[model samples]
Target: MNIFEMLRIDEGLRLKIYKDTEGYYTIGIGHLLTKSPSLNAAKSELDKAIGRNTNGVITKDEAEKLFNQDVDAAVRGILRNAKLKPVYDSLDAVRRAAAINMVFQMGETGVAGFTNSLRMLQQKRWDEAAVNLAKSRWYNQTPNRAKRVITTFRTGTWDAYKNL
Candidate 1:
């Protein structure tokens, strides 16, 4: 269910255009708080969201960044939930990476944050996770990263070489 494959771009210009406007891959690192420990709180909420939802669905708030809405407490609470450990444990490296990416973009309080799509991921449900992952906002915004992540999930490698 790769969205980029589904979109099927043929020209260099359109692909380039796509990369600039809506793509996170094109975004400057300054725009992202990826290395911020604040996101750890968000990670915790994901734990709770995964726990109660059990179906791989969570509310947007569960995915929001700690800096976005100052939801650190919420994020911490979710992480503290012992009940949700299984869900995080269930994900493969690729799916888990994508899921975290999803949380990064959607802001913990966004809709795609809580979608049931990741459940298939936690279960190692590759085909379904692929489908759901394709439909997810992460793929919608940056198809290149999504494709690379999926490739890594499948082959354990994303590039011909680690660095170009």
Candidate 2:
């Protein structure tokens, strides 16, 4: 399956502003409108995305644009990170999606925090890597998404996304 398509399911779509389960002002497929180096940066990007000058609404077309950009950011993040780059490259196509999804959900810094898990993943220690990643607060907070990602990481197949 396509990584971006899988991510769309996991992130879901939101055409209007809503706080994420993590309590951030998010919009457009888990896009965090509240995150930046600071607040004004967030506001500026949000305005640029919505294009209605802070009206707090978005069209499907804009949401599609933002989702593409978000996925681009997630992929770019993995390629740029020194530590994650090799680990990401070592995985198969499906497992690479798992890695990208991990970065997409947690950001590069957050995913990089999993030192042991990264090592296990890089070493092809799939079970240990999954077990280690499953122990995080992220797993607890979004267990179903975590399950799909971790299972994909462990199995290196699309079994996690099977049968709808």
Q: Pick the candidate with the highest TM-score.
A: 2
Off by over 4 Å in 1: 1-85, 92-95, 111-114, 153-164
Residues 62-129 of candidate 1 have per-residue lDDT tens digits of 32221233223323433454433355456554444443443434544553354465455556666666
User: What is the lDDT, from 0 to 100, of the residue 164 in candidate 2?
Assistant: 47
List model 2 lDDT by residue over 90-128, tens digit each: 889899888888887889878867989989999999999
lDDT of 1 at 151: 54
Question: Residue 114 CA error for candidate 1 (Å)?
Answer: 5.2
Model 2: colliding residue pairs: none
